[PDB]
Structure 1
Amino acid sequence: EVAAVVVVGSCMTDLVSLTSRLPKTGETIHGHKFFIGFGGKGANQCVQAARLGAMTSMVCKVGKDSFGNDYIENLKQNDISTEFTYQTKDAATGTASIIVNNEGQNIIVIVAGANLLLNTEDLRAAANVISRAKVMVCQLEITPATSLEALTMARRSGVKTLFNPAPAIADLDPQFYTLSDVFCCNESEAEILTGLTVGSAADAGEAALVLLKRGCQVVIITLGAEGCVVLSQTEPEPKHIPTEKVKAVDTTGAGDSFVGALAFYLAYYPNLSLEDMLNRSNFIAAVSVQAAGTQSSYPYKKDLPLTLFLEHHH
């Protein structure tokens, strides 16, 4: 009956306008389509996990506005607990305004808004839900100090920590590394965090080694169509996990699918090998890249192969 995956992080409303050319300074242009979507890394990861069958709770803060009420309703529609989804008069729900041209190039303006007002007192009220969970998931779209306190609470209670340093900041508090049981980022994030170039999968292996030695138990670097790379303290040699080639329609939010799937497996299938979790997580994320719309492309359990939810005797 209790939540097994707890996500502390961000909800954002995505506001997207499609145009033929991007506008220059001082220009007014007309686009040909507008749409809304439910976004934010925290809520994206939570939604994927829930749709796989996880019992989830989303700890976040939105506005006391239309976007916020709508966000709450979106979480409820996906069977996510909103017990610790706070609303505040003091800021608008977080927004991501995105303008896209015909070649796929874009301009993006994020206003984090209510997400920055999720504070330490707000977490403390959730201590019980956090201590009874199997996994706690965080990112860097809320106040860093809040994510860091979340990771600390989870650790104190023996709860597994899954940390996604996204978007990445150059001079990240090293406590994030030592509080991370599983540290998962993409290629360009690994460039920012380590100062290294990441073109190939071999390069990603070297970057991942630097992050491992800063104190992470497990490091995973996602690589788009190349799948992912994993290292651990017990197995520090890079292990490249490729994925079956697919016609990518839209890769937006695929990383959040991957991480949400990974949370699902860490929580409900703790005995699987790590290599196995990542295969399944690749597969699920790859289903998401085959459809448009971020959260609306994340697959439900009922639409997936049944073997993704089986395990043999160990």
Structure 2
Amino acid sequence: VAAVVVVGSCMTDLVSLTSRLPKTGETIHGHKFFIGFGGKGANQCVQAARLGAMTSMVCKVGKDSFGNDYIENLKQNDISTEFTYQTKDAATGTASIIVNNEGQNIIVIVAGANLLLNTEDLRAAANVISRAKVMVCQLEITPATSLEALTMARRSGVKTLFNPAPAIADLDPQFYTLSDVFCCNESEAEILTGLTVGSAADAGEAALVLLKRGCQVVIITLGAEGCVVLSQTEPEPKHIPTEKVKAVDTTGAGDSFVGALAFYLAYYPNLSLEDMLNRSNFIAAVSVQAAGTQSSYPYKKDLPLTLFLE
């Protein structure tokens, strides 16, 4: 039985590495290009799977080469594709990513078949959703479809992990009240609250705003600074540091973090939040030490044993 069900996105990542970002009108040269398997949903599901979770990926890709390749990718990662659909009416989603090694990126998503995943497609997955431990959603599919997946999870007492990524300033208030765990990064927290986040302290203040919108637990990820967490029971923010490492490629680190979190909510439900986050930070930091997104996500066998004890 799948313990972690992800209802969300698969994208073909078209990645260019550059030393600067381009400005309007401008052509710049990068030094490398590669294709990867991406999408926040799938990335999260892949990390959870590699840690040993039994997972199911509920998603929609194209009846195109990239979509066929995506399905094979999911199978190679031991992820159930029972509810991975293909449509001839849109192409597999695409994420064009420019990664500037000398600062912030730019991403352009054409979500394609992701946006055709509908409430009828979820209904077929109703038995899987209700027998799971954790349901994970993001904002790369139609928001109404994520909302329904959260609602279905809540009705069966399944823990909801929501990642509001990429963030929308006017997010439906139900996303907060249907989230047991609400996890976003610094720039997303800014978009969602209108506040500036330049410090662990600032993140704590943004997290409290989100908490008061009805989340049970809020986590803001902070790159090399780890994360900050608070909850309804314990509303004082805690700053959990991460492993000090030399980052090669941080792309998708957040997804690694969230997939780890899903794994621990599902298989180690009695751990303190602070423990789970220490472990999830450790995992995500392993991902930043290598190139790519999914190809840098570690397997259980390569990770210290203490990450799997209780």
TM-score interval, normalised by the smaller of the two chains: over 0.9
CA gap of 1:23–1:272, structure 2 versus 1, over 3 A, is closer
Deviations 1:116-145 (A, max 9, x none): 000000000000000000000000010000
- The Cα of 1:242 is off from its aligned counterpart by 1.2
Counterpart-to-counterpart distance in 1, 2:207 and 2:250: 23
Deviations 1:62-93 (A, max 9, x none): 00000000000000000000000000000000
Counterpart-to-counterpart distance in 1, 2:147 and 2:42: 18
- The Cα of 1:264 is off from its aligned counterpart by 0.1
Alignment of 1:193 with 2:192, yes or no, is: yes
- The Cα of 1:161 is off from its aligned counterpart by 0.2
Whether contact under 8 Å (2:20, 2:103) holds in the other structure is no
Match runs of 1:88-107 below 5 Å: 88-100=87-99, 103=102, 106-107=105-106
CA gap of 1:235–1:117, structure 2 versus 1, over 3 A, is same
Structure 1 spans left out of the alignment, 5+ residues: none
Q: Classify the secondary structure of the residue corresponding to 1:272.
A: coil
- The Cα of 1:48 is off from its aligned counterpart by 0.1
CA gap of 1:189–1:128, structure 2 versus 1, over 3 A, is same
- The Cα of 1:253 is off from its aligned counterpart by 0.4
Whether contact under 8 Å (2:61, 2:67) holds in the other structure is yes
Counterpart-to-counterpart distance in 2, 1:28 and 1:215: 45
CA gap of 1:66–1:249, structure 2 versus 1, over 3 A, is same
Deviations 1:279-308 (A, max 9, x none): 000000011111111000000000001111
CA gap of 1:104–1:219, structure 2 versus 1, over 3 A, is closer
Whether contact under 8 Å (2:12, 2:35) holds in the other structure is yes
User: Which deviates further from its counterpart, 92-101 or 204-213?
Assistant: 92-101
- The Cα of 1:106 is off from its aligned counterpart by 4.7
How many equivalent pairs are there? 310
- The Cα of 1:28 is off from its aligned counterpart by 7.0
Deviations 1:168-206 (A, max 9, x none): 000111111010000001111111111111101011111
Counterpart-to-counterpart distance in 1, 2:266 and 2:90: 34
Deviations 1:36-69 (A, max 9, x none): 0000000000000000000000000000000000
CA gap of 1:22–1:83, structure 2 versus 1, over 3 A, is same
Counterpart-to-counterpart distance in 1, 2:28 and 2:202: 42
- The Cα of 1:96 is off from its aligned counterpart by 1.1
Match runs of 1:1-314 below 5 Å: 2-18=1-17, 32-100=31-99, 103=102, 106-311=105-310
Q: What is the CA RMSD across the aligned residues, in angstroms?
A: 1.7
Deviations 1:233-284 (A, max 9, x none): 1101111111231111111100000000000000000111111100000000
Counterpart-to-counterpart distance in 1, 2:175 and 2:209: 14
Q: Classify the secondary structure of the residue corresponding to 2:277.
A: helix
Counterpart-to-counterpart distance in 1, 2:157 and 2:252: 29
Q: Classify the secondary structure of the residue corresponding to 1:13.
A: strand
- The Cα of 1:27 is off from its aligned counterpart by 7.2
CA gap of 1:220–1:25, structure 2 versus 1, over 3 A, is closer
CA gap of 1:256–1:21, structure 2 versus 1, over 3 A, is closer
Counterpart-to-counterpart distance in 2, 1:101 and 1:198: 21
- The Cα of 1:22 is off from its aligned counterpart by 6.0
User: Which deviates further from its counterpart, 41-50 or 20-29?
Assistant: 20-29
Structure 2 spans left out of the alignment, 5+ residues: none
- The Cα of 1:13 is off from its aligned counterpart by 0.2
Whether contact under 8 Å (2:243, 2:281) holds in the other structure is no
CA gap of 1:224–1:36, structure 2 versus 1, over 3 A, is same
Whether contact under 8 Å (2:46, 2:79) holds in the other structure is yes
- The Cα of 1:103 is off from its aligned counterpart by 3.8
CA gap of 1:223–1:163, structure 2 versus 1, over 3 A, is same
Q: Classify the secondary structure of the residue corresponding to 1:26.
A: coil
